[PDB]
Paper text:
V. vulnificus secretes a large multifunctional-autoprocessing repeats-in-toxin (MARTX) as a main virulence factor via an atypical type I secretion system. The central region of the MARTX toxin of V. vulnificus MO6-24/O contains an autoprocessing cysteine protease domain (CPD) and four effector domains including the domain of unknown function (DUF1), the Rho-inactivating domain (RID), an αβ hydrolase (ABH), and makes caterpillars floppy-like domain (MCF). The CPD directs the proteolytic processing of effector modules after activation by binding to the eukaryotic cell-specific inositol hexakisphosphate (InsP6). The V. vulnificus MARTX CPD displays a canonical CPD structure with the central seven-stranded β-sheet flanked by three α helices.
To examine the structure of the processed CPD, we purified the wild-type CPD lacking the N-terminal autocleavage sequence (post-CPD, residue 3592–3796). The post-CPD construct in the absence of InsP6 was susceptible to proteolytic degradation of the C-terminal β-flap during protein expression and purification. We obtained the crystals in a week at room temperature and determined the structure of the post-CPD at 2.2 Å resolution. However, the C-terminal β-flaps (residues 3762–2796) were not visible. In the asymmetric unit of crystals, there were two CPD molecules coordinating a single molecule of InsP6 in the center of the non-crystallographic two-fold axis. Considering the proteolytic susceptibility of the β-flap, it seems that the crystals were formed by proteolyzed fragments lacking the β-flap (post-CPD Δβ-flap) or that the β-flaps were completely disordered. A single molecule of InsP6 in the crevice of the dimer interface interacts with the four basic residues of the InsP6-binding pockets from each protomer. Compared to the structure of the pre-CPD-InsP6 complex, the position of InsP6 in the post-CPD Δβ-flap was shifted 3 Å away from the binding pocket to share the coordination of a single InsP6 molecule by two protomers. Due to the lack of interaction between the β-flap and the β7-α3 loop, the catalytic residue Cys3727 is displaced 5.4 Å toward the helix α1, occluding the substrate binding pocket. Though the dimeric structure of the post-CPD Δβ-flap is physiologically not relevant, the monomeric structure seems to represent the inactive conformation of the core CPD when InsP6 is not loaded to the post-CPD.
Residue numbers in the entry:
A (entry chain B): 3590 to 3611, 3614 to 3761
B (entry chain A): 3592 to 3610, 3614 to 3762
The structure:
């Protein structure tokens, strides 16, 4: 996969969010961009463009610092999903895959920490019903679902119980 | 009451078109004989009326096709399981149309092989949506889908699973 840059959120590229016509059962979503890669930043922007009125895009670095780069978190309400956007890469110390440098266990811990910090600062009280993992690298179908089922358990271990889907960015 | 016996006598599904998807086709699996469930299944197929197949299946694993052409299925496939979620009086033993999560997984794995003996599609589904026509709690929904994932994944059938309510 591509080289991993997930440091120093303030420096990150921002892609223009373009609304496109081309009706979801969620009322809002947080699109969580997890590395500073142009393909990844574009896929995050495109997801928000598909639902421009109720999408918030957050970039978050390995230190846990985040920036809202699109949308209004105050407006978030109802049934929410999260879409995580990153590159899945093979690991050399296991047969597990890593999403933007995170293992499923590390990702769940990071996301639980992010949720309380983000609900803290933004002063909103809501939790995702569903989490989508949107991989911009083409890793195999098995390792995709393997990561997802690992992630479900790890999310559960961390106090957030969610449906999870894994797919490839179009 | 639960009516999941004798699929030949079930109310049938009439699908009105309605207005893509990342799935190239789907099987809507109707799990009980009930007007609300039957209407929900028809509603689902109405959203993709040219690539959706509706199947009804009883408590014996016998089934029938009531909408669409199975032989035209291929590509990335979704299954949507439609029924009424009911409480067993054991907290996270919620049952969908009489089936616990384990029994649902066994049933669906048995249906796929049985279905392929006649249609010969053998296309593993990428995704399974459980569509509950009764209001079931958020935690029970997730717990149900979680057990279902585990049974499916243990049996070699690794899929994404989501659990929701239908409109009614
Ligand atoms: O609105 P629905 O008919 O219920 O189908 C949606 C929709 O799928 P399609 O529009 O492609 O048919 C979503 O697609 P997008 O939100 O990506 O545009 C998909 O969301 P995901 O891609 O995150 O999977 C989601 O699937 P799910 O929420 O189960 O993961 C699925 O809703 P259901 O399959 O649950 O009914
Ligand atoms: Na759909």
């Amino acid at each position: 996969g591509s080289i991993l840059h997930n440091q120093n959120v303030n420096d990150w590229e921002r892609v223009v969010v373009t609304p496109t016509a081309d009706e979801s059962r969620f009322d809002g979503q947080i699109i969580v961009q997890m590395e500073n890669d142009d393909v990844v930043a574009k896929a995050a922007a495109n997801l928000a463009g598909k639902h421009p009125e109720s999408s918030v895009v957050v970039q978050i670095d390995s230190d846990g610092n985040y920036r809202v780069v699109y949308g209004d978190p105050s407006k978030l309400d109802g049934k929410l999903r999260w879409q995580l956007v990153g590159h899945g890469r093979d690991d050399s110390e296991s047969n597990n895959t890593r999403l933007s440098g995170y293992s499923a266990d590390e990702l769940a811990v990071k996301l639980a920490k992010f949720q309380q910090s983000f609900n803290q600062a933004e002063n909103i009280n809501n939790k995702p019903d569903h989490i989508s993992i949107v991989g911009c690298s083409l890793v195999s179908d098995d390792k995709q679902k393997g990561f997802g089922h690992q992630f479900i358990n790890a999310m559960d271990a961390n106090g957030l119980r969610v449906d999870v889907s894994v797919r490839s960015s179009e």
